[PDB]
Design a protein around this ligand. Structure first.
Ligand SMILES: OC[C@H]1O[C@@H](O[C@H]2[C@H](O)[C@@H](O)[C@@H](O)O[C@@H]2CO)[C@H](O)[C@@H](O)[C@H]1O
Ligand SMILES: OC[C@H]1O[C@@H](O[C@H]2[C@H](O)[C@@H](O)[C@@H](O)O[C@@H]2CO)[C@H](O)[C@@H](O)[C@H]1O
Lengths: 133, 133
């Protein structure tokens, strides 16, 4: 079951998204999206896309249906059949992705942080908990 | 119990996250997390003090040797013999203290974030991990 929840107040520097779950044994990909709205194809301030199928974790943003320049994290700190914990931490400069015990990648803001109003977690992932602090 | 004491010579900013994982000993009385202005009784931007003996969690600041106005959180989200996870999250306006799965208390800043240059975790606590993200 995907997570999709509204952040009508937005998120500010000091917001922490904590995701706990398990990558299923047959997983291809899953995604964490910080979106500007609920509509179809909404702009994305952050698309965080662990890809088991292609052994990469892609970061990107989306504006007017156009993806930006992809960033990739170092290695893939996810494994099929294994549980994980991700922090997505918002600062004034960007989003810090923490996986397990280590900062994994820093994605500088493209879209103003104030554009974020929705969080979505979906794809091939079993979710134990999603929290916004 | 081995305490933690580490330097933040660059300071901390909105989006800094202190994650503490540990266990409250079965005979614990109290433990503390301090964000301090320096290496010495240095000023404390945050003193986070779970007290199992008196069933309270106290928050305070200290300047020039004098404690400020105490704040207390609702209940005690710690138990002797039980493991715990605390997030101390810095925003522009204060520190969000998260325990377990929920925000426990918000402590508005008394000292500027730029003056924080040391993290201490000590007292009656067994530390499994202390991370600054
Ligand atoms: O950039 C995020 C999107 O990537 C799309 O796939 C890219 C792929 O990463 C890139 O290597 C290149 O081959 O073009 C593809 C299509 O843009 C995904 O399809 C999309 O879901 C986002 O993950
Ligand atoms: O930062 C709070 C400090 O409190 C001290 O204890 C207080 C106590 O909380 C209060 O209710 C009253 O009884 O006065 C005491 C003395 O200030 C602690 O002793 C100190 O270690 C700090 O935690």
């Amino acid at each position: 079951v995907p997570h999709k929840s509204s952040l009508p107040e937005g998120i500010r520097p000091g917001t922490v998204l904590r995701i706990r779950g398990l990558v299923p044994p047959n997983a291809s990909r899953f995604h964490v999206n910080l979106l500007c709205g609920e509509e179809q194809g909404s702009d994305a301030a952050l698309h965080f896309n662990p890809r088991l199928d292609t052994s990469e974790v892609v970061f990107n943003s989306k504006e007017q249906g156009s993806w930006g320049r992809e960033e990739r994290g170092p290695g893939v700190p996810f494994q099929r059949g294994q549980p994980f914990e991700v922090l997505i931490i918002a600062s004034a400069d960007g989003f810090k992705a923490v996986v397990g015990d280590a900062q994994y990648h820093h994605f500088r803001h493209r879209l103003p942080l104030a554009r974020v109003r929705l969080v979505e977690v979906g794809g091939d992932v079993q979710l134990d908990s999603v929290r916004i602090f």
